[PDB]
Amino acid sequence: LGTNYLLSGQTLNTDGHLKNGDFDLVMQNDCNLVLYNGNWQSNTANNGRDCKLTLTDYGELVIKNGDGSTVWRSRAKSVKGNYAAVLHPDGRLVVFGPSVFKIDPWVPG
Amino acid sequence: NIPFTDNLLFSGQVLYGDGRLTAKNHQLVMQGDCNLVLYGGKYGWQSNTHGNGEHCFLRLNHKGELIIKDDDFKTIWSSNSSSKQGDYVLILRDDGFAVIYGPAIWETS
Ligand SMILES: OC[C@H]1O[C@H](OC[C@H]2O[C@H](O)[C@@H](O)[C@@H](O[C@H]3O[C@H](CO)[C@@H](O)[C@H](O)[C@@H]3O)[C@@H]2O)[C@@H](O)[C@@H](O)[C@@H]1O
Ligand SMILES: OC[C@H]1O[C@H](OC[C@H]2O[C@H](O)[C@@H](O)[C@@H](O[C@H]3O[C@H](CO)[C@@H](O)[C@H](O)[C@@H]3O)[C@@H]2O)[C@@H](O)[C@@H](O)[C@@H]1O
């Protein structure tokens, strides 16, 4: 996982961080997704155990407990594709998508 | 202006004079010789624009198009990935791909 972004299909596991300078996003053990120094939280403390942050192919951020039950969702959705949730240096977590261009250094093209 | 993050380039931000994005061993450099070069992956990548202009710069606009302009605003290279109006981000990912995502569909604030 990248240090400051999350891609669709990826998981920010329990006690995992996304960090950009002083802004520290934590998917906590108590199920609360907290953006430290960013005055933002999902407000889902004690709503489950072994909670994980995912990003759907429609650009929706989802918090699921250990059994895979949805605890919280960002609600905003767009077209099927590849999205990226980025911790902006000004202290906002932003979902961007879908992908419109890619540089591929793994294939000569 | 927006503060810089080593692996990110947001809409409006500019790279030039060997300014670059880095992630692990990967580097995406807007070189002084007007060539945009990705050093990394297996084969790397280049815009193949060495000497096509002077004092060139890279800029991601608010439609998701990534462009190399010279000192006189002559187009040197373009991603030709123009999409919906909004905020975009170019990410030099940990896996070597440099991907443009947008528009922004959700934010914490
Ligand atoms: O300063 C930002 C914000 O702080 C407070 O919200 C974040 C806290 O929300 C809950 O209280 C918890 O999720 C807490 O998490 C800590 O305590 C847990 C219980 O001990 C623990 O399991 C977690 O690992 C973590 O240590 C969050 O820290 C609140 O005061 C907001 O008003 C304020 O904006
Ligand atoms: O692995 C990335 C890429 O490398 C090769 O293309 C990039 C080179 O293209 C031109 O030769 C130059 O832009 C060169 O830049 C270096 O040399 C310049 C002078 O010749 C100098 O001004 C620059 O600062 C830099 O030192 C690039 O390195 C090629 O193998 C690609 O296939 C490959 O993908």
Q: Does domain B1-109 have CATH number 2.90.10.10?
A: yes
User: Is A22 a pocket residue for ligand 1 (Cβ < 6 Å)?
Assistant: no
Resolution of the experimentally solved model in angstroms: 1.9
Other CB atoms within 10 Å distance of the CB of residue A49 = 12
Number of domains, chain A: 1
> B93, A7: Cβ pair inside 8 Å?
yes
> Residue A93: which CATH number?
2.90.10.10
Q: Which amino acid is at A108?
A: P
> B109, A39: Cβ pair inside 8 Å?
yes
Distance separating alpha carbons of residues A9 and A4, to the nearest angstrom:
16
User: Is A28 a pocket residue for ligand 1 (Cβ < 6 Å)?
Assistant: yes
Judge whether B38 is closer than 8 Å to chain A, CB to CB: yes
Cβ(B9)–Cβ(B60) below 8 Å: yes
Which of B3, B41, B104 is opposite residue A90, by nearest beta carbon?
B3
What is the arrangement of strands in the sheet containing A93-96, beginning at the earlier edge strand? Answer: A5-7, A84-87, A93-96, B104-107
Its domain, for residue A85, covers: 1-109
Which of A20, A60, A95 is opposite residue B104, by nearest beta carbon?
A95
Closest to B93 measured CA to CA, from A71, A106, A79: A106
Q: What is the largest CA-CA distance in chain A?
A: 50
